[PDB]
Amino acid sequence: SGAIYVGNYRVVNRHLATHNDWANLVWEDSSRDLLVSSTTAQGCDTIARCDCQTGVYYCSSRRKHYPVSFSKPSLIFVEASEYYPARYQSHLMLAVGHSEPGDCGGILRCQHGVVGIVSTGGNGLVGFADVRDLLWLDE
Ligand SMILES: COc1cccnc1CN1CCC[C@H](C(N)=O)C1
Ligand SMILES: [Zn+2]
């Protein structure tokens, strides 16, 4: 679990979005595993606008943060789960690191701000849904 809170927006994994997220929907994209909903309170986070390929992510199944080197956002095949059919997920960045399904929502940060959220993984890999291209999150 986990979310990004920026301005009057809440960014979550689309497959973990709640009934309240869908009732206050701003934008969603199944191919990215992202959903953004509106909030009444001002958020705590800020978004990176950069090309960093290193950063630190929070891993809830270890209660720890780990440093990672990750690939640039790209189209990556993701196997079927109870949430999606087997498909290509876009804007995904892969790294070597521990992750389990419940780790989705953990934030990846670089020195500039939030980069994305945990969305995929297994077998010593962890994948992050990028949010740096969503410029409207800041307006
Ligand atoms: C950290 O995520 C892990 C780890 C291990 C195994 N499965 C996942 C996530 N997995 C299941 C939920 C939907 C997700 C997706 N974006 O399609 C894929
Ligand atoms: Zn950066």
Task: Give the per-residue SS3 of the chain.
Answer: CCCEEECCEEEEEHHHCCHHHHHCEEEEEHHHCEEEEECCCCCCCCECCCCCCEEEEEECCCCEEEEEEECCCEEEEECCCCCCCCEEEEEEEEEECCCCHHHCCCEEEECCEEEEEEEEEECCEEEEEECCCCHHHHC
Around 127, how many Cα atoms within 13 Å sit in the side-chain half-sphere? 23
**Residue 55 Cα to ligand 2 middle (Å):** 8
**Residue 45 Cα to ligand 1 middle (Å):** 24
Q: How many CB atoms lie within 10 A of CB 105?
A: 19
15: annotated active-site residue: yes
Residue whose CA lies nearest to ligand 1 atom number 10: 120
Q: Judge contact between 102 and 60, C-beta under 8 A.
A: yes
19: annotated active-site residue: no
44 in a labelled binding site: no
Q: Judge contact between 29 and 17, C-beta under 8 A.
A: no
Cβ of 97 less than 6 Å from ligand 1: no
- The ligand that comes nearest to the alpha carbon of residue 109 is 2
Cβ of 29 less than 6 Å from ligand 1: no
Q: Judge contact between 63 and 78, C-beta under 8 A.
A: no
59 in a labelled binding site: no
Residue 43 sits at the vertex; the CA angle it makes with 38 and 48, to the nearest 5 degrees, is 100
Resolution of this deposited model, Å: 1.2
103: annotated active-site residue: no
Cβ of 119 less than 6 Å from ligand 1: yes
Q: How far is CA 133 from CA 5, 31, 51, in A?
A: 16, 15, 10
